[PDB]
């Protein structure tokens, strides 16, 4: 190509969007923004495919152009705005507020939030370095830059960000023993306790996570996101709570449901 | 001396005409020879820390970083100036016959003056940015043959 | 050879056709921007001085200043320059076009002339009636300059001087006046205060 691609073929879209293959030749091309195109959920999908408020591509534009949708406390009018992990979506007219969290099967879930809990979000620190004039600053994995951070904050830590004051309220150091969630790969959406950190010079760092039921799984450091200090996460989790059940166990529940339901 | 080219060879950023003395200062400051550790558990040879050669492609005293793939092989050719050919021997699996065949690959690599190498010696090479048309590796360690 | 005579001072223009070769000898060998006396062009043109601005050959190709030849040449021209309008073409697009030289010759089909100095008798339809300008000044500074206004004197009270009044076919009355640009108003001062406030 001679430049930037502006189209996304439907079969080339991320699988976790769950788009029907015969629905059309194209899928919403995520706009540039805080989250990567492969790790986001465009507002058009959220409003039309997840919440059913809009029935067509056109109706999504009408909803957004009325300034009825807010992401991280700010109104967004871009249909393909890349809403991602931990983002807070608020719809004042419906009095609804959701947080984008992965379900245990690795797909974004619109977790309904209370009004009190919708005033903050968690961000993962990418790096900390000195800026112009020797002023230290840190940048996160959601595109945010914070100046004059706490000196104790380091890379891979998690910071609690207040969407009103736009300031770091509290932070969690990345260390063994904290509860973390997997944000990418095969184990995406699983929650467990960080048990070990295996460092390999010049290579990716591997982290071993043990589930609450004793199941142990590994992953890369880049796919980990600390949720709380100790064993209690600082955010509300969905019903599964990051517990991945085997297909046999899942089938067992389905069989029981039919008998009762 | 090491000054054998038409130009005067010196390490960049090392000022050799300072009124003050370099005693008690880190390498590369006060006129002291500059050297660094490449990491990954490799040791800096004594010949590079205490040497007088100038080589901007040296992994220890030059301006090249080691990052990427670390490979090992045997010195195949040592006739070029500060460059050697490293032969890497490996087995290629033939699926249909469920057997292997011996293959090889010649990897050009830069060798700094701090290293002594001869044909047949075992060498370890670390990847670096393109240094020439074919060279993308730098010698990090040399084990004499029969040792 | 035809002649397009224009009078910048009066705003009028007229086309003159001359077929006498002896009368055209004055213009021959002349270049663009050079002045030619109208005494030999005719009797009614006594005392008139004409400036050569350009022309077109018998094939319609225009004359280009700086081409010191009497023939036609092909040049790689930029859009918007004379002899290449380039309407509806890519920005930065260059086109090779044929242009006649700047030297006047009998090969020309028409010459554009500008009256730089009138003579004794005023020509009919060129110096008899003055065509008023269609539009008046629109920038605030130009309006003050036109009426010699001062810093304190208001400017919006003088635009009504050249206000245009007319009657529409479907209506009866209609007046239009220009919008003054670069006019200092309370809103403009408010913006400046806000911008300075943001810096603090």
């Amino acid at each position: 190509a001679r430049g930037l691609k502006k189209h996304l073929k439907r079969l080339n879209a991320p699988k976790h969007w769950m788009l029907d293959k015969l629905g059309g030749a194209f899928a919403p091309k995520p706009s540039s923004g805080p989250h990567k195109s492969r790790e986001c959920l465009p507002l058009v999908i959220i409003l039309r495919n997840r919440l059913k408020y809009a029935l067509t591509y056109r109706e999504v534009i009408s909803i957004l152009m009325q300034r009825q949708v807010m992401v991280d406390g700010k109104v967004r009018t871009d249909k393909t705005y890349p809403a991602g992990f931990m983002d807070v979506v608020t719809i004042p007219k419906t009095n609804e507020s959701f947080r984008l969290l992965y379900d245990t099967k690795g797909r974004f879930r619109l977790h309904s939030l209370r009004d009190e809990e919708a005033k903050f979000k968690l961000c993962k620190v990418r790096s900390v370095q000195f800026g112009q004039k020797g002023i230290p600053y840190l940048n996160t994995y959601d595109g945010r830059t914070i100046r004059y951070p706490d000196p104790l904050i380091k890379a891979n830590d998690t910071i609690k960000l207040d969407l009103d004051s736009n300031k770091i309220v509290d932070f969690i150091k990345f260390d063994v023993g904290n509860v973390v969630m997997v944000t990418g790969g095969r184990n995406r959406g699983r929650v467990g306790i960080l048990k070990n950190r295996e460092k390999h010079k010049g290579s990716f760092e591997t982290v071993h996570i043990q589930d609450s039921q004793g199941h142990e799984f590994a992953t890369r450091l880049g796919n980990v996101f600390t949720l709380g200090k100790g064993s209690k996460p600082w955010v509300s989790l969905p019903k599964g709570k990051g517990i991945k059940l085997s297909i046999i166990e899942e089938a067992r529940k389905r069989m029981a449901a039919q008998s009762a339901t | 001396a090491e000054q054998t080219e038409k130009a005067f060879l010196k390490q960049p950023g090392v000022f050799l005409s300072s009124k003050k003395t370099g005693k008690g200062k880190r390498p590369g400051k006060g006129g002291n020879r500059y050297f660094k550790s490449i990491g990954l558990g490799f040791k800096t040879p004594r010949e590079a820390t205490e040497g007088t050669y100038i080589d901007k492609k040296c992994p220890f005293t030059g301006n090249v970083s080691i990052r990427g793939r670390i490979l090992a092989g045997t010195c195949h050719s040592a006739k070029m100036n500060r460059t050697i050919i490293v032969r890497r021997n490996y087995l290629h699996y033939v699926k249909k016959y469920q057997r292997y065949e011996k293959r090889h690959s010649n990897i050009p690599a830069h060798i700094s003056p701090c290293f002594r190498v001869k044909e047949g010696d075992h060498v370890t090479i670390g990847q670096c940015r393109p240094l020439s048309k074919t060279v993308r590796f730098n010698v990090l360690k040399v084990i004499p043959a029969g040792s | 050879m035809k002649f397009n005579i224009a009078n910048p001072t009066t705003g009028c223009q007229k086309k003159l056709e001359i077929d006498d070769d002896q009368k055209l000898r004055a213009f021959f060998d002349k270049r663009i921007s050079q002045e030619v006396s109208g005494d030999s062009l005719g009797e009614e043109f006594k005392g008139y001085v004409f400036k050569i601005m350009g022309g077109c050959d018998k094939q319609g190709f225009p004359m280009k200043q700086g081409v010191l030849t009497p023939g036609r040449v092909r040049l790689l021209l930029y859009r918007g320059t004379p002899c290449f309008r380039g309407y509806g073409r890519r920005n930065g697009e260059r086109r090779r076009k044929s242009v006649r030289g700047c030297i006047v010759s009998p090969d020309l089909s028409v010459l554009n002339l500008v009256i730089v100095k009138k003579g004794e008798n005023d020509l009919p339809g060129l110096t008899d009636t003055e065509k008023p300008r269609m539009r008046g000044p629109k920038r605030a500074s130009k309006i003050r300059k036109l009426f010699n206004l001062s810093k304190e004197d208001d400017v919006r009270k003088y635009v009504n001087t050249y206000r245009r009044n007319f009657t529409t076919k479907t209506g009866k009355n209609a007046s239009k006046a220009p919008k003054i640009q670069r006019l200092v108003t309370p809103l403009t001062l408010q913006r400046k205060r806000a911008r300075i406030a943001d810096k603090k």
Binding site: - | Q3, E5, S17, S18, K133 | -
Partner: protein, 184 residues
């Protein structure tokens, strides 16, 4: 035009490379600046990839040169090119390129030296000038060329890239190395 692609090159084995695509704009080159010493300064602005700017100096006469030992930098006139390690033909053509040895006017540095050390090569003012004179040392080779009014200097900038000819005053063993090359 000029291209930096490897397609036209032979393989490391020596075999030819059959062409499989046309030249790309993102791998182009441009004509050398060939900057010369001349009082008619001329630097042309060049628009490069990304909308950025490069300054191509065709002729230069002055430069910003730094006296490393004294830690003083002054603007001075470039007088002559005396040595070039890449091609001696660039010396007689007076071409300004990085690492070229040139002679610069010594007048700007003499004024600072007199103003700083009070020496040619107000009660409180004399108090500090004599204090700084205690630790004053001047290389014999460096001082010898102050009489002629010219200092050997090395160009450290790239006139064809940044449009400027900056450098540093040669001293120490580097000065000895180059002056030996000029001793014929």
């Amino acid at each position: 035009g000029i291209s930096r692609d490897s397609m036209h090159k032979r393989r490391a084995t020596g075999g030819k490379k059959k062409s499989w695509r046309k030249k790309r704009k993102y791998e182009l080159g441009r004509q050398p600046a060939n900057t010369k010493i001349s009082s008619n300064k001329t630097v042309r602005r060049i628009r490069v990839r990304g909308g950025n700017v490069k300054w191509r100096a065709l002729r230069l006469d002055t430069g910003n040169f730094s006296w490393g030992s004294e830690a003083v930098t002054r603007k001075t006139r470039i007088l002559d090119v005396v040595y070039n390690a890449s091609n001696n033909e660039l010396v007689r053509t007076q071409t300004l390129v990085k690492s070229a040895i040139v002679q610069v006017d010594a007048a700007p540095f003499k004024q600072w030296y007199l103003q700083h050390y009070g020496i040619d090569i107000s009660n409180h003012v004399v108090r500090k000038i004599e204090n700084r004179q205690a630790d004053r040392k001047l290389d014999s080779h460096l001082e010898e060329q102050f009489a002629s009014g010219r200092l050997l200097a090395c160009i450290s900038s790239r006139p064809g890239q940044c449009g400027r000819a900056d450098g540093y005053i040669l001293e120490g063993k580097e000065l000895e190395f180059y002056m030996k090359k000029l001793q014929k």
